[PDB]
Amino acid sequence: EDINVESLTQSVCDLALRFGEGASGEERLMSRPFGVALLIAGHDADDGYQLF
Amino acid sequence: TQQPIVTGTSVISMKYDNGVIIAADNLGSYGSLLRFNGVERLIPVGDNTVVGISGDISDMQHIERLLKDLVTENAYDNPLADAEEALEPSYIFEYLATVMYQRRSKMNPLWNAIIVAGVQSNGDQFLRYVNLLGVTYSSPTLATGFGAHMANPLLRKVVDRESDIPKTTVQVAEEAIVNAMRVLYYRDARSSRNFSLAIIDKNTGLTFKKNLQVENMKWDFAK
Amino acid sequence: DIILGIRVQDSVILASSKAVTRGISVLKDSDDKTRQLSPHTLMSFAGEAGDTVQFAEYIQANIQLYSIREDYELSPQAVSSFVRQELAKSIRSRRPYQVNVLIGGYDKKKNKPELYQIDYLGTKVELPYGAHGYSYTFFLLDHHYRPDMTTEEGLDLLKLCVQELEKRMPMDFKGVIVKIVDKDGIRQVDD
Amino acid sequence: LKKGEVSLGTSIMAVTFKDGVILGADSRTTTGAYIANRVTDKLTRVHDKIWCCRSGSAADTQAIADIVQYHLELYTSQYGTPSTETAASVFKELCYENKDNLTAGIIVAGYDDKNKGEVYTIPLGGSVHKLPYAIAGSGSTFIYGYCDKNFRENMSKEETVDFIKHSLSQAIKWDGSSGGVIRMVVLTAAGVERLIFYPDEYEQL
Amino acid sequence: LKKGEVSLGTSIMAVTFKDGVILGADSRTTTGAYIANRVTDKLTRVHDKIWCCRSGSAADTQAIADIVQYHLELYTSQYGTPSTETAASVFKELCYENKDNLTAGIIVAGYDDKNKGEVYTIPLGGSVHKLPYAIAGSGSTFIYGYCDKNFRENMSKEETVDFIKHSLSQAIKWDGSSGGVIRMVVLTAAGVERLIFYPDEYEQL
Amino acid sequence: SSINGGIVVAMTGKDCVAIACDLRLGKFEKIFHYGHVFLGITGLATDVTTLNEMFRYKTNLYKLKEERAIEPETFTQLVSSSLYERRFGPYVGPVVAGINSKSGKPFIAGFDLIGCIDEAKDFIVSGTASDQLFGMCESLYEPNLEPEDLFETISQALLNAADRDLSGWGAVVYIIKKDEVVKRYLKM
Amino acid sequence: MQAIADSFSVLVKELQYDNEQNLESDFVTGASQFQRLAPSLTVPPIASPQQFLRAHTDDRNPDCKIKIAHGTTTLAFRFQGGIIVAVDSRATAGNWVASQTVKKVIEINPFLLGTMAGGAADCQFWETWLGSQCRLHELREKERISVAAASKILSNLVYQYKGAGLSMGTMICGYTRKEGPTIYYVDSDGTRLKGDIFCVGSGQTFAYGVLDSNYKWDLSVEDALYLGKRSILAAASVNLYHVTEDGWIYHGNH
Amino acid sequence: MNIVPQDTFKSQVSTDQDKSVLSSAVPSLPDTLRQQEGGAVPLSTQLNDRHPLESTLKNWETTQRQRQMEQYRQIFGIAEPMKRTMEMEIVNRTDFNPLSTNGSIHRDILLNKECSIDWEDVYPGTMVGDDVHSKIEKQLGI
Amino acid sequence: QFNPYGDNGGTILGIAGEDFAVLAGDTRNITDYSINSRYEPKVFDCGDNIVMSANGFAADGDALVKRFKNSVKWYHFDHNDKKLSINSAARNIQHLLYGKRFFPYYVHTIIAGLDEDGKGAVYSFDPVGSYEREQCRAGGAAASLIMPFLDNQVNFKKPLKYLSVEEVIKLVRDSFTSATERHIQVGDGLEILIVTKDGVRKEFYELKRD
Amino acid sequence: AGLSFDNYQRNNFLAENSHTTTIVGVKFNNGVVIAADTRSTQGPIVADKNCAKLHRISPKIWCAGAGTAADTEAVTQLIGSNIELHSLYTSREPRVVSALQMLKQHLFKYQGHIGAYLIVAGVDPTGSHLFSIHAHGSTDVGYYLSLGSGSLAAMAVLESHWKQDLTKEEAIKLASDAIQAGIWNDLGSGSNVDVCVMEIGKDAEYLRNYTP
Numbered sequence A: 001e002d003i004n005v006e007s008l009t010q011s012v013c014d015l016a017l018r019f020g021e022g023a024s025g026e027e028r029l030m031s032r033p034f035g036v037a038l039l040i041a042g043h044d045a046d047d048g049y050q051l052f
Numbered sequence B: 001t002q003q004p005i006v007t008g009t010s011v012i013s014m015k016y017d018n019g020v021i022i023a024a025d026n027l028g029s030y031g032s033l034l035r036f037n038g039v040e041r042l043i044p045v046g047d048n049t050v051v052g053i054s055g056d057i058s059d060m061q062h063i064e065r066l067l068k069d070l071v072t073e074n075a076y077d078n079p080l081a082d083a084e085e086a087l088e089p090s091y092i093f094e095y096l097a098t099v100m101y102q103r104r105s106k107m108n109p110l111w112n113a114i115i116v117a118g119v120q121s122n123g124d125q126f127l128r129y130v131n132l133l134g135v136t137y138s139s140p141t142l143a144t145g146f147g148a149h150m151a152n153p154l155l156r157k158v159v160d161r162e163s164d165i166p167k168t169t170v171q172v173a174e175e176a177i178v179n180a181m182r183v184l185y186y187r188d189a190r191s192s193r194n195f196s197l198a199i200i201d202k203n204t205g206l207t208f209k210k211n212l213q214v215e216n217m218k219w220d221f222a223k
Numbered sequence C: 001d002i003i004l005g006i007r008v009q010d011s012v013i014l015a016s017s018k019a020v021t022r023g024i025s026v027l028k029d030s031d032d033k034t035r036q037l038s039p040h041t042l043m044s045f046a047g048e049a050g051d052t053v054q055f056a057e058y059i060q061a062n063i064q065l066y067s068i069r070e071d072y073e074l075s076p077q078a079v080s081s082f083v084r085q086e087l088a089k090s091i092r093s094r095r096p097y098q099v100n101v102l103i104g105g106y107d108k109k110k111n112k113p114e115l116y117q118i119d120y121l122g123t124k125v126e127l128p129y130g131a132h133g134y135s136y137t138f139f140l141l142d143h144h145y146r147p148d149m150t151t152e153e154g155l156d157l158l159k160l161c162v163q164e165l166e167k168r169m170p171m172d173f174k175g176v177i178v179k180i181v182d183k184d185g186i187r188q189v190d191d
Numbered sequence D, E: 001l002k003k004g005e006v007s008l009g010t011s012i013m014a015v016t017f018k019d020g021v022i023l024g025a026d027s028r029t030t031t032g033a034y035i036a037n038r039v040t041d042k043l044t045r046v047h048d049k050i051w052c053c054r055s056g057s058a059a060d061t062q063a064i065a066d067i068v069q070y071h072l073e074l075y076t077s078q079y080g081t082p083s084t085e086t087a088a089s090v091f092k093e094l095c096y097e098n099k100d101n102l103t104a105g106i107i108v109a110g111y112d113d114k115n116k117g118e119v120y121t122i123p124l125g126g127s128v129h130k131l132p133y134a135i136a137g138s139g140s141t142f143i144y145g146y147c148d149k150n151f152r153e154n155m156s157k158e159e160t161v162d163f164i165k166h167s168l169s170q171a172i173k174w175d176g177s178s179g180g181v182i183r184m185v186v187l188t189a190a191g192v193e194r195l196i197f198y199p200d201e202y203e204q205l
Numbered sequence F: 001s002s003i004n005g006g007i008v009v010a011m012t013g014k015d016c017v018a019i020a021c022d023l024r025l026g027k028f029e030k031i032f033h034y035g036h037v038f039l040g041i042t043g044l045a046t047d048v049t050t051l052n053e054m055f056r057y058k059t060n061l062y063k064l065k066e067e068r069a070i071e072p073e074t075f076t077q078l079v080s081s082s083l084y085e086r087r088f089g090p091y092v093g094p095v096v097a098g099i100n101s102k103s104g105k106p107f108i109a110g111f112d113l114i115g116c117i118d119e120a121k122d123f124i125v126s127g128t129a130s131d132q133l134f135g136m137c138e139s140l141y142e143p144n145l146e147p148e149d150l151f152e153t154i155s156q157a158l159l160n161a162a163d164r165d166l167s168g169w170g171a172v173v174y175i176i177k178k179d180e181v182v183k184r185y186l187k188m
Numbered sequence G: 001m002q003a004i005a006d007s008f009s010v011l012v013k014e015l016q017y018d019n020e021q022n023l024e025s026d027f028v029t030g031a032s033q034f035q036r037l038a039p040s041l042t043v044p045p046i047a048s049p050q051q052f053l054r055a056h057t058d059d060r061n062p063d064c065k066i067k068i069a070h071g072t073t074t075l076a077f078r079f080q081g082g083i084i085v086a087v088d089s090r091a092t093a094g095n096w097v098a099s100q101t102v103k104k105v106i107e108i109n110p111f112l113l114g115t116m117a118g119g120a121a122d123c124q125f126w127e128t129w130l131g132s133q134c135r136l137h138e139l140r141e142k143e144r145i146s147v148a149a150a151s152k153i154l155s156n157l158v159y160q161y162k163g164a165g166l167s168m169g170t171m172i173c174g175y176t177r178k179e180g181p182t183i184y185y186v187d188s189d190g191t192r193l194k195g196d197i198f199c200v201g202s203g204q205t206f207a208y209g210v211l212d213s214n215y216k217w218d219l220s221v222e223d224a225l226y227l228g229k230r231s232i233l234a235a236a237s238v239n240l241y242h243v244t245e246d247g248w249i250y251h252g253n254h
Numbered sequence H: 001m002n003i004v005p006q007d008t009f010k011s012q013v014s015t016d017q018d019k020s021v022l023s024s025a026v027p028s029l030p031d032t033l034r035q036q037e038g039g040a041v042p043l044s045t046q047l048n049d050r051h052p053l054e055s056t057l058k059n060w061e062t063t064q065r066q067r068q069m070e071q072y073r074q075i076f077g078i079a080e081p082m083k084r085t086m087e088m089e090i091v092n093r094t095d096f097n098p099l100s101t102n103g104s105i106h107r108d109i110l111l112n113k114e115c116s117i118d119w120e121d122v123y124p125g126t127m128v129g130d131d132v133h134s135k136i137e138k139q140l141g142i
Numbered sequence I: 001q002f003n004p005y006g007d008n009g010g011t012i013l014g015i016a017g018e019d020f021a022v023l024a025g026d027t028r029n030i031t032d033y034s035i036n037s038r039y040e041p042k043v044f045d046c047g048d049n050i051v052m053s054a055n056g057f058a059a060d061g062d063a064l065v066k067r068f069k070n071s072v073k074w075y076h077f078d079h080n081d082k083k084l085s086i087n088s089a090a091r092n093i094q095h096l097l098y099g100k101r102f103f104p105y106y107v108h109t110i111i112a113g114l115d116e117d118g119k120g121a122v123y124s125f126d127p128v129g130s131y132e133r134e135q136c137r138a139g140g141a142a143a144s145l146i147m148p149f150l151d152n153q154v155n156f157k158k159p160l161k162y163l164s165v166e167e168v169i170k171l172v173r174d175s176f177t178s179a180t181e182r183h184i185q186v187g188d189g190l191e192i193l194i195v196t197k198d199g200v201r202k203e204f205y206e207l208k209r210d
Numbered sequence J: 001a002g003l004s005f006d007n008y009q010r011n012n013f014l015a016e017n018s019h020t021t022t023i024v025g026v027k028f029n030n031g032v033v034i035a036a037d038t039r040s041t042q043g044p045i046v047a048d049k050n051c052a053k054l055h056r057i058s059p060k061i062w063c064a065g066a067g068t069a070a071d072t073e074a075v076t077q078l079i080g081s082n083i084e085l086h087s088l089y090t091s092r093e094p095r096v097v098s099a100l101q102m103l104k105q106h107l108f109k110y111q112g113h114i115g116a117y118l119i120v121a122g123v124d125p126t127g128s129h130l131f132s133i134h135a136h137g138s139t140d141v142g143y144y145l146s147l148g149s150g151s152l153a154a155m156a157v158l159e160s161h162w163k164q165d166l167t168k169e170e171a172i173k174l175a176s177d178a179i180q181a182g183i184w185n186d187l188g189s190g191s192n193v194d195v196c197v198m199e200i201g202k203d204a205e206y207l208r209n210y211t212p
Helices: A005-019 B057-074 B089-105 B151-156 B170-187 C051-070 C076-090 C138-143 C151-168 D058-079 D084-097 D144-149 D157-174 E058-078 E084-097 E138-142 E144-149 E157-174 F045-066 F072-085 F132-140 F147-163 G002-007 G020-025 G049-056 G120-141 G147-160 G205-213 G221-235 H043-047 H052-058 H061-075 H079-094 H105-111 H132-140 I058-078 I086-098 I143-153 I165-182 J008-016 J069-090 J096-109 J151-160 J168-185
Strands: A041-044 A048-051 B011-015 B019-025 B027-030 B033-037 B042-045 B049-055 B112-119 B125-130 B136-138 B141-143 B194-201 B205-213 C003-007 C012-017 C025-027 C034-038 C041-047 C099-107 C112-118 C124-126 C129-132 C176-182 C185-189 D011-017 D020-025 D035-037 D044-047 D050-056 D104-110 D118-122 D133-137 D182-188 D192-197 E012-017 E020-025 E029-031 E034-037 E044-047 E050-056 E104-110 E118-122 E133-136 E182-188 E192-197 F007-013 F016-022 F031-033 F037-042 F093-099 F106-111 F117-119 F123-127 F171-176 F181-186 G074-078 G083-088 G096-098 G105-107 G112-115 G169-176 G180-187 G192-195 G197-200 G238-244 G247-251 I011-016 I021-026 I029-031 I034-037 I051-056 I107-114 I120-125 I131-140 I190-196 I199-205 J022-028 J031-037 J040-042 J045-048 J055-058 J061-067 J116-124 J127-133 J139-141 J144-148 J193-199 J205-211
Touching (some): A005 A041, B011 B049, B011 B125, B019 B042, B019 B049, B042 B057, B042 B194, B049 B089, B057 B112, B089 B125, B089 I058, B125 B141, B141 B151, C003 C099, C003 C112, C012 C151, C025 G192, C041 C076, C076 C099, C076 C124, C099 C129, C099 C176, D011 D104, D011 D157, D020 D104, D020 D157, D044 D058, D050 D133, D058 D084, D058 D104, D058 J096, D084 D104, D084 D118, D104 D182, D144 D157, D144 E144, D144 E157, E012 E050, E020 E157, E050 E058, E058 E084, E058 H061, E084 E118, E104 E133, E144 E157, E157 E182, F007 F093, F007 F106, F007 F132, F007 F147, F016 F037, F016 F106, F016 F147, F037 F045, F072 F093, F072 F106, F072 F117, F093 F123, F106 F123, F123 F132, F132 I143, G002 H079, G074 G205, G083 G112, G105 G120, G112 G120, G120 G147, G147 G180, G221 G238, I021 I107, I058 I107, I086 I120, I107 I190, I131 I143, I143 I165, I165 I199, I165 J045, J022 J116, J022 J127, J022 J168, J031 J127, J031 J168, J055 J069, J055 J116, J061 J069, J061 J144, J096 J127, J127 J144, J151 J168, J168 J193, J168 J205
Antiparallel strands (some): B011 B141, B027 B033, B042 B049, B049 B112, B112 B125, B125 B136, B194 B205, C003 C012, C025 G197, C034 C041, C041 C099, D011 D020, D020 D182, D050 D104, D182 D192, E012 E133, E029 E034, E044 E050, E050 E104, E104 E118, E182 E192, F007 F123, F016 F171, F031 F037, F037 F093, F106 F117, G083 G238, G180 G192, I011 I131, I051 I107, J116 J127
């Protein structure tokens, strides 16, 4: 099935959280936080068209 | 391991209208040699749970150690361990079944058959069976080894189905258990005359009886 | 899986049979039992399916990497030694698999052709001629081999060997892909 | 032994005393771990005062006992009451000539006017040994030292009865193939006497 | 048991009496039918008043005994004299956690001012049992009944010495792998005492 | 030329019997008669032929001596004894069907390879698989059927068995009454 | 130092839940088991896993046996402008009722197809995995993956588990702009062949003979479809697939 | 409290179990070229036909070290194993010698093997890799 | 060599209607020629109107059901309590089964529910993972005694589409009674779970062993 | 003559090439009762739901068997023929001891290759007798015996409710209860119960489907 846009956005944010402790308790992965902002545009059956 | 070395024979358990009754004999046999007399194979966990284990004695002692560790960890750090925060028989059985299946999947099983009996907080009787393969099942009457072939029909004559549970008093269940133990001592070569009994009742609590002997032996029909 | 290699005074001729699979009907025009290690070094292999092709492609990748890194072409002797070492290393901690390798090259520094054979255990031997597969033909090669034979004489001998092999084979022996390695490089004979 | 064949995991004790002989045994027949019969009469009567106990294959021992009883009936039809030595010789010949196909072991207890009661043992293989007393079976291995320490020559009847009772009680206690009741046959000049003891009697010794 | 090893076929006994404990054994080490060592000290010491006897595989038992002595030295450095229960627990853990690789069985005898002498047995598999007396080895099977008929609680030192001597003499007599001399260690409040009995003394019993 | 194995089904109707056997098409039938008794044998072809010849021999001698045709029960006992004779060298699955000439009751029975008799009041299935065909027969069987209804039932069972595993599949069906025997072929 | 202290601080050991893999596989700490691009396969912790699996896979419930794709005749050939893939739709008897025809052909992508000719579960699982890999490659490179690349990926994957117990033989057929129409055969033994005509199944010599009788490069779509149908019938309900540069098109019998 | 090592067998396998050597074109598959093992070595072959003593010898000093730590925890407390492990980890992590494989003197002093020799000490025992940069990447995790 | 597998018998049956699904199973757990339990359910409600049943080795089936339920719980946690479809559940079960390819579960699995359109859907899984959607499937050591009964008393081409839930329940009960009469393993009870848009309903019938 | 050994080598060659119940007896104060279940199964499948497992050697000597069905039936029939001929020759009522001797000798002759395990009950002028016979030629004497796959439940029931002095009705009830327990608790036992009661001086009473 297609992944919900909010689920993908949450996954990307969990990746961005890797300069510290991860959501599931993983150790640090990167020395500094990211320097990128993202606009994620999607469509799913549950919530129609979404922009995050 | 690959095979039991010192082994227990049978544990038999029944449900009655107010609780559960379990029993097992005290013997550890070294092959065909009846070696150790005075082996307690019923483990009282909490104030309402009894675990009966049949099979390898070393694995039984390992399971006893696990149960003691679980009881000790339950009080860490609950100040209400004796209160409503005690261990239900369902928790203990779930833990034991998980352990048995995990060890079976690791090709290093515990050669045991385990029957967990008790009374829940709401008063519901609990009676479950697990084995070295992790196979679990429930029934108003349970038994292991030769008890599963001889004592089981005798117990099922009393508690035939779920509707017969409220009709069975504690005296009837205890008498049936004693008779089944006598039959097992009659027709099992690895059995023992001495056995222990445990009654878990939602009103009177836990009653543990030790040093019970098979009586009313019929041997006069010889000559 | 039958492979042959004949070394003549000025070149090396390598012949390989069409690869077939049990119970599978395939029609193609390709040489999947031969890899070009270098513009003047060719390799033919025969053995168990899967492992042999992986080993051949691994060897080809390593040799191409060396050629790119050094901007130079390895000699056939060095190529054969590297193949022998890698083959011995492959079965270092596993059950050995059936594989036989014929390596034919033309050393430019010595300006002469060379041919080597390596078996499944990793035994490298330099030969004037070699074959693998059916176990018949060594007598025919022995009676009709000269160190100073030309390319045409070697091709005639190879044709005779192919005909002899086809006669014994129950008419299931398809064509033979023939390649020649010499000073001009590696070419394929469509005759 | 053959696959699926019944084996005689018994406890047998024959003791010679001042007035004759006593042969005792248990009464359990097993199928590995399930007790097929709680009460069995392992004391086989071959002649009026010549009894035996069997070990090994049940079928082979029963066939041998039947043939020996037939042979002793034939002998009695000619020369009267036989002797324990003759019965032991017949048992030994049958067991030794057939040891390649039959697994059998016998303990023979007899009485006669000439010899005044004797015990013979024929283990697996077919060799006959004459002993003051003999023990056999799976449980017999647990009472070797006890019997060795507590045996005397020319004991009285009650002393021999007590000795056999204690030894068989220990053998039953330590062995899983030994059963409830103890059966003893006393062969003396007066006649043949049969005694039976129950678990509630000897377990309290 | 791995092929080609050495098996500790022996006669091990440990008896608790009024003033402490006594641990006894034979001195025979055999490899098949050949007596490899007819003078063997099988009374392994793991602490000043904690001794043990080993059975199964010699190498595994020696390694376990060395590790247990190391553990008890650490404990003594930290907390002082350990009790026999602690040594038995260490033995049981070592035997149980390696039961898929090592075959070992131990009999542990000990003494302390509180418990006043104790006997523990760890058979093959790793289980532990506390008994008033223990017997083990290939030659033990012949004295079981005897040991069940002559043991009394709170015996004097001489009575225990005689009981162990008689039982081990019978086990030596009836077992092919048991022989030589009898070695006994007496653990009481006074100290550790060594006793050795020669064949010419116990064979006349 | 492999002809080893097959399926034979026997059913009892109101006052009749039906015995059917599978064929192979692409001359070798597995049903034989010795008067008013029918026998179907499944298994090794050589054993089938040997049993057919031996039973023809014995039935001919029985008719010559007794001066009457043999009854299905007596033939069942004879087949059982003959099978038990080769106790250590046993041959197959035999099925016996018929109607007694005096009482008129239908009779069907089956045998193992050492002559153990299984007398079935409903139906007998003999064959290698004996799982799909057995289930189809169990679902399709109704007691006390007319000869036409019984024939339809057994033909439907055979067709259903054939459908669930061919080009050269056929069947032979015998509908046996007290006074008439009808033989039919099924070509799927 | 805190982790070191916690390691030597005291049930979880018996449950084997101190290991990351056990917690992940039992879905204790999250749904990370269903997030692995390369799946993890359980192996018995014994010295002989392969012999164990081989012994236990030949022992007797019919429902609890590993399903094997039937050795039906499968054919594939590339004539001028596509690939014709022909299969026979002859169902096998069983204790079930099918709501549709048996899917003897796996649709990897709108542009790739594969055949089972082996173990059903292995083929389905690994061809779905190959489709995911091809989709990821196309997302990364912004271009359709070559058929050679997909066949090589599948071959490497099945070679990494060579001898473990996998049994699958597939035909990857695809039409790309750079290469044209290409057919590869990938076996569970690591074999990887490239061909113009492929015939497999219980009977394929007759189909190959029929093809060789009437095969040429200068064919047409209708002629190639008729040739494939005739070959399948002669080898004996003929499902056809025509693969062009725009994708594959399915025909029940036409 | 183990004498012979236990649980040396793998429970799960995958194509990306070796995280250090993975392909870049297909990250879910291993990189055969950079493995430099022979080119025809599937991972499954490592699960069968191994010498029984190889696992025992490969993990033997680790088992004794773990048993010693368990004994210290049982007799001394958490602090003693914690300190021993902390010292050993500090010593191991500080050292980085890409041109040598022999252990440091301080590691042997902590392990109490200053005057001890085994066959590992006597016998300490390409186109791609085995250079300084690969070891730097492995050490730093980049 | 320790044998990690076993067998507990039992029979299950899954049928798909036009707006409902039915999954039934005999409630008897038995070892070799002995009755462990006369009532041990093998069909469970695994979340969002999905019924699942694994027949064969009991421990493997319990483990698979437990893992699937935990996966569903984490799926609800991750995606805003989104309802899990029957096809997604089928693929999840396929991955769970194939994750043990070299140490397989000794079970045959059947799940039932409603598809996106609202029709009944039944999926069948072999022990290693291969699955397909079927109108009717019988598993266990009674399928050869149940499938011909259904094929005789109904057609899947009375068409199955026009059947109601009561008729399907009656057919299942009759087939299981016939199997109980013919087969020793089958008996002692029959539990049926019916999945409709209103949810999951449970019914129980007593067979001929008490 | 006798049982044939032909095609033994052929059968072995084919095999190498891939070419392939509850019974109780209870002795009461004036006779013996033998009871059995009535289900015949060809494995998982129930072949017959009402089968007579009580076979008759003599008008007052009955038996029930297990093991190989064909061997049991053949041996019982042969011993019955021998017993009838012996009774005609001696003009006396046959004895259970004679049948026991014939069965024992015949089974020992074949060295266990004839698989038939029997419970034999009977009444003769010397009294009532009950024996158990093993396939290798060993026989045992008892007061209550059980046989078959459901013999453990039957033995439990018999041990529960057995006394020295039992009447006919009590013995019949005990045998019926033992067979019922075997039927309920064992998968291989089912259906009805067949009983045969033999007293001293009275005809044998054979009750088929005593409890349905």
